[PDB]
């Protein structure tokens, strides 16, 4: 009937069938599309009972609807109830992917050509979203889906904001300013950490709190310049350290990539490199093609986004944004 799977109901209508549970905002399943005759990925999200729930899903739904890219995931369809009252669940239907980078970096090893290519598709895709003055805020290997033909796409646009921070967060990829970060440069750091993780097959900065993540970076990045309150006094108390050479952690790595890696993983956000600049790096000459690589047609405009609204009004906003996909409307 409703094609209930695992433990709860998964009413996706006659359109999608043969539900397979993938795992994991909410439940994620792989259904078969009959309209396009190709397996797709449906994720069930059931918010509306929390303040920050309705925002991030609206933020993700909006952005993914107005974006089109070869390296950014795209919503194919959305399903929900005809009315406000009966609408309790939202079904985001997106095209199916074989795996993500987190599952890739474990159990599997990448060549320098495969590493360079992925970092490119990250950057090629990142420079589009960054061209629209929008921040991803939370970039992770788990948020980088991978196509069978080595094509990379980006997800998790819930925490996205235009160019509460502290709310529910793997804190291995946060920037030195997001220790406790509101620019493009905070994403580059994450992408920098990812490159370091693709290069070592292991997390560059382990531990997800102050005694480790911002402490282990001091072991590699070293003590900062005096350019750099309770986080301030804590660092000054800690003994001075030196920067361990990137060609010691990564001795069998490309000399080109290590240069870029250091340019991406600088301490201070200022002059911490930029998109397009990173694309122009010698490590990415075989793939860089500014004539083909798409950019944002126009920055993400305002007035329509100011989520200090109650959950009651946010649900209404979800309804409008979703009505564009509703079969009868």
């Amino acid at each position: 009937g409703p094609e209930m799977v695992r433990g709860q109901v998964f009413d996706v209508g006659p359109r999608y069938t043969n539900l397979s549970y993938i795992g994991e905002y909410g439940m994620v399943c792989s259904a078969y599309d009959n309209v396009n005759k190709v397996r797709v990925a449906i994720k069930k999200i059931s918010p509306f009972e929390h303040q920050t729930y309705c925002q991030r899903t609206l933020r993700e739904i909006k952005i993914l609807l107005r974006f089109r890219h070869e390296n950014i995931i795209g919503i194919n369809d959305i399903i929900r109830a005809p009315t406000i009252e009966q609408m309790k669940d939202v079904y985001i239907v997106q095209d199916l992917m074989e795996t993500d980078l987190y599952k890739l970096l474990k159990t599997q090893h990448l060549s320098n050509d495969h590493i360079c290519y992925f970092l490119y598709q990250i950057l090629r895709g990142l420079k589009y979203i960054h061209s629209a003055n929008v921040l991803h805020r939370d970039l992770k290997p788990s948020n980088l889906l991978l196509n069978t033909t080595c094509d990379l796409k980006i997800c998790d646009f819930g925490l996205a904001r235009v160019a509460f921070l502290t709310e529910y967060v793997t804190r291995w990829y946060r920037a030195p300013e997001i220790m406790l970060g509101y620019t493009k440069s905070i994403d580059i750091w994450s992408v920098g950490c990812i490159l370091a993780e693709m290069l070592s097959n292991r997390p560059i900065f382990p531990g997800k709190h102050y005694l480790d993540q911002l402490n282990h970076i001091l072991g590699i990045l070293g003590s900062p310049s005096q350019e750099d309150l309770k986080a301030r006094n804590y660092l000054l108390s800690l003994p001075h350290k030196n920067k361990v050479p990137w060609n010691r952690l990564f001795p069998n790595a490309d000399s080109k990539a290590l240069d870029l890696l250091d340019k991406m993983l600088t301490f201070n956000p200022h002059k911490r490199i930029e998109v397009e600049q990173a694309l122009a790096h010698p490590y990415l000459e075989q793939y860089y093609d500014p004539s083909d690589e798409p950019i944002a047609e126009a920055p993400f405009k305002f007035d329509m986004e100011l989520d200090d609204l109650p959950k009651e009004k946010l649900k209404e906003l979800i309804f409008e944004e979703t009505a564009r996909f509703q079969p009868g409307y």
Partner: peptide, 12 residues
């Protein structure tokens, strides 16, 4: 002639 290179990585 198949560009974009030929490798399928694989399973979740």
């Amino acid at each position: 002639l198949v560009k974009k290179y030929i490798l399928a990585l694989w399973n979740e």
